[PDB]
Amino acid sequence: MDLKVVVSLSSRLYTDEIAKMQQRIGCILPLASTHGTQNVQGLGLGQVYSLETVPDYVSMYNYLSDCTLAVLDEVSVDSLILTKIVPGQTYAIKNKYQPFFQWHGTGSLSVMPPVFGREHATVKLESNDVDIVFPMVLPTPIAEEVLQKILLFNVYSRVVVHMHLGSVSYLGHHYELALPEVPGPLGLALLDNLSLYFCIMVTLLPRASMRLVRGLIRHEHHDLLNLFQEMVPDEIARIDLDDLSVADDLSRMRVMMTYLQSLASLFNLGPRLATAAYSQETLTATCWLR
Amino acid sequence: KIHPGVAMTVVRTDEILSENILFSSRASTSMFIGTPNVSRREARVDAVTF
Amino acid sequence: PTIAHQRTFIVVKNCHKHHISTEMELSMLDLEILHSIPETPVEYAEYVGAVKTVASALQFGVDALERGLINTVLSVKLRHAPPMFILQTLA
Amino acid sequence: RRRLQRRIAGLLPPPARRLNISRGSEFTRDVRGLVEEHAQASSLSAAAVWRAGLLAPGEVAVAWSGWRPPVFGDFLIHASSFNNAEATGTPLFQFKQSDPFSGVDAVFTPLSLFILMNHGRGLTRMANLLYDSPATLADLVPDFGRLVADRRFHNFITPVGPLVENIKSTYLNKITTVVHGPVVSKAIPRSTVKVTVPQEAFVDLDAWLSQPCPADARLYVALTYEEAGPRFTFFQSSRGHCQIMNILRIYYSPSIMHRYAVVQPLHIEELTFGAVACLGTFSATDGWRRSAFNYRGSSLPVVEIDSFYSNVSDWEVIL
């Protein structure tokens, strides 16, 4: 099967732009159309991530999850060649991303809009008058962390501690990601769905877990219990004054597991890539689309 | 239907479907022709798209 | 040259590549009945139509490339063509 | 070291992904070897079996191409529950029965599953014309109104892919469904099967929104519980599952207000508002060509998904 997309640049390409795009070989690029020959407009994430002050992340997640992906391998003057990522094939993807997030063995990579700034991943084509930005491919234990940091900065905006939430902290180095103030109507609808889910959580949550954790803060000193600072909250106590029953707790647990998967799919946005056999000396991972 | 203190100049644009004539002198462009290679892009469950 | 009452203009022109590609689509039925051998005349009469389909799809794909080469040549003649009202004064 | 060379000499050559042709009018041996696909059926003789390559291990080759064979499901059902004059490509819905060793299954067309939704309270002309007695369908499910009321109907129906082969048996019918894989027919002359979903149930979601053009537009089913009874709407969307759950909450946000307004969730199990599941992927350029399903005197409009790849998933709740 032939998966190869030649993107013919309508203009030429300068030598420094040749070097800057030749540095980004092996980096995943989204594609508007899945066909054999495309133009440079519609390539990359730079359409919805235009040269403006505010970033709109879920407007780019609406772009990333929809359109097809491609891995940049060969780029010369007047044309750059790509290799499509279709489901049902297996690809080798290299760790060629400027925030050096070390990939785990057989982990999961979730491609993402560039959270560490536009200019951290951008090739400016002055001759072709378009601006190609590159989506960041970071592992899902780090990707979920930076997405929840974005949404916690969203819900902590009217209250404001800032530099701790505004930066991701990795074992290699702590990195500072760019944060919007308004994602538009597409971003507030995400916290609308999340707030509806959290409200139905605080409806159907059981009480035996509260009866465990109240007496276990009052009994045992665990590292999972240090964040309370040895304080049992008042809603926990005034709920635990009511006597317990297992018959309602089974019906609460049977609607808790089904809802938690639906809450997990709320942060599962963006394309998911599954890896295999990643070695740090070759920096490549035999990785197929999930 | 009385006059305000101001006038206005109304600028509009007008598309026109022409029927052009292209001249091009003899031997003005050297070109190299490749080979028309068929491929296999995607095999669906009933049709493969060359 | 000069007129007595020395310049050399070294200029470089670079070629520009032009990729064109159309997509034909052939059903898997008239390939699996194309690979097999027919025994009865009503299956040979279908294998004939199945080789006509793949032949007129391949010939469609190589007709749409000598139709696309002329389109590319005409659309690259149409980009290095400044209009008459500029070249009647410039030339 | 030469025996290993002869072993690799059969293992080296990949499928021809490209082939530089000179003319299409010549139709060479090489482009014929490129376009030829090996068949899955032949006449029962040693020459036709050896030339079809049926005895080859793993795939078919006369003696890896992206083509995976489908896996079929075979269901012995009650012949009064199914109508034999239905279309060939129609999705079916197996009800996980409550009896431990029942040897007869319970499958449901979206017309067959519709008269479960109606009785207790277009399609309804055709769904009442196909099945003259809904009481023989209402006892396949042992407790339908109970299971709907506590919102546990979605995890009891599992979709089993579209029908391909249905032998008209008298008492205990047997049907063949592609439960996963390429939806292709099993017949002696092989022909294409198109997934027929009724038009008043099928609601498009790409046009309900009204420049990125993806390749595959996945098909979704949606069992959603309303006040008039549960519903089965079939969604066509080009976006992923993480997008389909958000846009399905956006699409069904008035109906959550309606279900919260007309009844009150006095129990904790009435909180769930339906669940959806992916039924499989089809091409986005030529999908969902409308057609008709002509029964004896009436015809309901039907939508016909061609080149379907059945891949069912577990239900994702909508809330």
Give DSSP secondary structure letters for D25-70: SS--HHHHHHH----S---SSHHHHHHHTTTSSSS------S-PPP
Provide the pairing of β-strand A174-176 with A68-76. unpaired
- Spacing of C-alpha D30 from chain mean position: 37
Residue type, D304: E
CB pairs under 8 A between A and D: 88
Q: Which residues of B touch C25 (CB under 8 A)?
A: 47-50
Beta bridge partners of A287: A91
Are A1 and D15 within 8 A, CB to CB? yes
For residue D93, give both structure tokens: 């819905």
Tell me, letter by letter, the H, E, C secondary structure of A207-266: CHHHHHHHHHHCCCCCHHHCCCCCCCCHHHHHHHCCCCCHHHHHHHHCCHHHHHHHHHCC
Cβ contacts of D237 within 8 Å, gap of 6 or more = D205, D206, D217, D218, D220, D243, D244, D247
Are D204 and D288 within 8 A, CB to CB? yes
What is the DSSP code (8-state) at residue A3? -
Are D120 and D148 within 8 A, CB to CB? no
Neighbours of C, requiring at least 3 CB pairs below 8 Å, are A, B, D
Sign of CA dihedral A19, A25, A31, A33: positive
For residue A91, give both structure tokens: 């690809």
What is the DSSP code (8-state) at residue A116? T
Dist. CA D141–CA D116, nearest whole Å: 9
Q: Interior CA angle at B34 toward B30 and B37, to 5°?
A: 160
Q: What are phi and psi of A5, to 5 degrees?
A: -120, 115
- Exposure class string for D85-97: b at 16+ Cβ within 10 A, else e: ebbbbbbbbbbee
Q: Do C23 and B50 touch (CB under 8 A)?
A: yes
Chain C nearest-CA distance from A121, in A, is 28
What is the DSSP code (8-state) at residue A115? T
Could you tell me which chain C residue has the CA closest to the CA of D54?
C36
Q: Which residues of B touch D15 (CB under 8 A)?
A: 40
C19 inside 8 A of chain A by CB: yes
CA distances from A63 to A264, D132, D279 (A): 20, 49, 23
For residue A166, give both structure tokens: 């505004």
Sign of CA dihedral D288, D290, D295, D298: positive
What is the DSSP code (8-state) at residue A149? H
Sign of CA dihedral D103, D109, D113, D115: negative
Dist. CA D161–CA D164, nearest whole Å: 9
Dist. CA A1–CA D14, nearest whole Å: 10
B41 inside 8 A of chain C by CB: yes
Chain D nearest-CA distance from B43, in A, is 7
Among the partner-chain residues D27, D39, D51, the one whose CB lies closest to the CB of C58 is D27
Are D193 and D183 within 8 A, CB to CB? yes
Q: Do C28 and B48 touch (CB under 8 A)?
A: yes
Provide the pairing of β-strand D91-95 with D71-78. unpaired
Dist. CA D31–CA C80, nearest whole Å: 38
- Exposure class string for C30-66: b at 16+ Cβ within 10 A, else e: bbbbbbbeeeeeeeeebbeebeebbbebbbebbebbe
Dist. CA C45–CA C60, nearest whole Å: 22
- By the 10 Å C-beta count (0-12 exposed, 13-18 middle, 19+ buried), A48 is classed as middle
- By the 10 Å C-beta count (0-12 exposed, 13-18 middle, 19+ buried), A151 is classed as middle
- Exposure class string for B3-40: b at 16+ Cβ within 10 A, else e: eeeeeeeeeeeeeeeeeeeeeeeeeeeeeeeeebebbb
Could you tell me which chain B residue has the CA closest to the CA of D282?
B44
Tell me, letter by letter, the H, E, C secondary structure of A5-53: EEEECCCCCCHHHHHHHHCCCCCEEEECECCCEECCCCECCCCCCCCCC
CA distances from D312 to D93, D181, D187, D238 (A): 11, 10, 24, 16
From A45, A69, A71, A70, select the one nearest A59 (Cα to Cα): A45
Residue A85: CB atoms within 10 Å: 23
Could you list the beta-strand ranges (E) of chain C. Answer: 25-27
CA distances from D87 to D130, D168, D174, D204 (A): 12, 13, 16, 21
- By the 10 Å C-beta count (0-12 exposed, 13-18 middle, 19+ buried), A53 is classed as exposed
Dist. CA A202–CA A194, nearest whole Å: 12
> Which DSSP helix (H) or strand (E) runs through A168?
strand A167-169
Q: Interior CA angle at D143 toward D140 and D146, to 5°?
A: 150
CA distances from A228 to A54, A152, A224 (A): 36, 19, 9
Q: Which of B39, B41, B49 has the highest number of chain A CBs within 10 A, making it the mutation to test binding with A?
A: B41
Among the partner-chain residues A86, A88, A255, the one whose CB lies closest to the CB of D268 is A255
Among the partner-chain residues C26, C69, C81, the one whose CB lies closest to the CB of B50 is C26
Q: Do C23 and A36 touch (CB under 8 A)?
A: yes
For residue A55, give both structure tokens: 């970033």
Any long-range contacts for D207-211 (C-beta under 8 Å, 24+ apart)? D208/D251, D209/D247, D211/A32, D211/A42, D211/A47
Chain A nearest-CA distance from C6, in A, is 32
Dist. CA C85–CA D98, nearest whole Å: 85
Could you list the beta-strand ranges (E) of chain B. Answer: 37-39, 42-43, 47-49
Dist. CA D199–CA D301, nearest whole Å: 5
Cβ contacts of D258 within 8 Å, gap of 6 or more = D226, D227
Among the partner-chain residues D212, D250, D316, the one whose CB lies closest to the CB of A32 is D212
Residues of A engaging B, defined by a Cβ cutoff of 8 Å: 1-4, 34-36, 86
> Which DSSP helix (H) or strand (E) runs through C62?
helix C41-77
Query: Max Cα separation, chain A?
Result: 76
Dist. CA D60–CA A72, nearest whole Å: 34
For residue D214, give both structure tokens: 């993806």
For residue D115, give both structure tokens: 């008269």
Cβ contacts of A198 within 8 Å, gap of 6 or more = none
Residue type, A240: D
Dist. CA D158–CA D245, nearest whole Å: 19
Dist. CA D34–CA D36, nearest whole Å: 6
Query: Among all chains, which residue has been given the structure tokens 């958000």?
Result: D246
Provide the pairing of β-strand A167-169 with A174-176. antiparallel
Provide the pairing of β-strand D202-204 with D230-237. parallel
Dist. CA B45–CA B20, nearest whole Å: 47
What is the DSSP code (8-state) at residue C78? T
Q: Which residues of B touch D283 (CB under 8 A)?
A: 44
Residue type, A123: V
Sheet with D289-294, strands from edge to edge, namely D195-198, D299-305, D289-294
Among the partner-chain residues D27, D32, D37, the one whose CB lies closest to the CB of C32 is D37
Dist. CA D212–CA D29, nearest whole Å: 39
Beta bridge partners of D176: D74, D165
Cβ contacts of B34 within 8 Å, gap of 6 or more = none
What is the DSSP code (8-state) at residue A104? P
> Which DSSP helix (H) or strand (E) runs through A59?
helix A57-64
From A86, A85, A88, select the one nearest A29 (Cα to Cα): A85
Are B38 and D19 within 8 A, CB to CB? yes
Sign of CA dihedral A137, A138, A144, A150: negative
Query: Treating both helix axes as pointing N-terminal to C-terminal, what angle do A256-264 and A185-204 enclose, rounded to 10 degrees?
Result: 160
From D142, D91, D143, D96, select the one nearest D112 (Cα to Cα): D91
What is the DSSP code (8-state) at residue A61? H
Q: Which of A1, A6, A82, A86 has the highest number of chain B CBs within 10 A, making it the mutation to test binding with B?
A: A1
DSSP, residue by residue, chain D: --HHHHHHHHHSPPP--EEE-S-SSS--HHHHHHH----S---SSHHHHHHHTTTSSSS------S-PPPEEEEEEEETTTS-TTS-SS-EEEEE--SSTT--SB----TTTTHHHHHTT--HHHHHHHH-S-GGGTTTTSSSHHHHHHTT-STTTEEEEEEEEEEE--SSEEEEEEEEEEE-----SS-----EEEETTTEEESHHHH---B-SEEEEEEEEEE-SS-EEEEEEEESS-HHHHHHHHHHHHHHHHHHHHHHS---SSGGG---EEEEEEEEESSS--EEEEEE-SS-EEEEEEE-SEEEE----EE--
Residue A10: CB atoms within 10 Å: 14
CA distances from A161 to A117, A154, A165, D77 (A): 21, 14, 6, 63
Are A25 and A72 within 8 A, CB to CB? yes
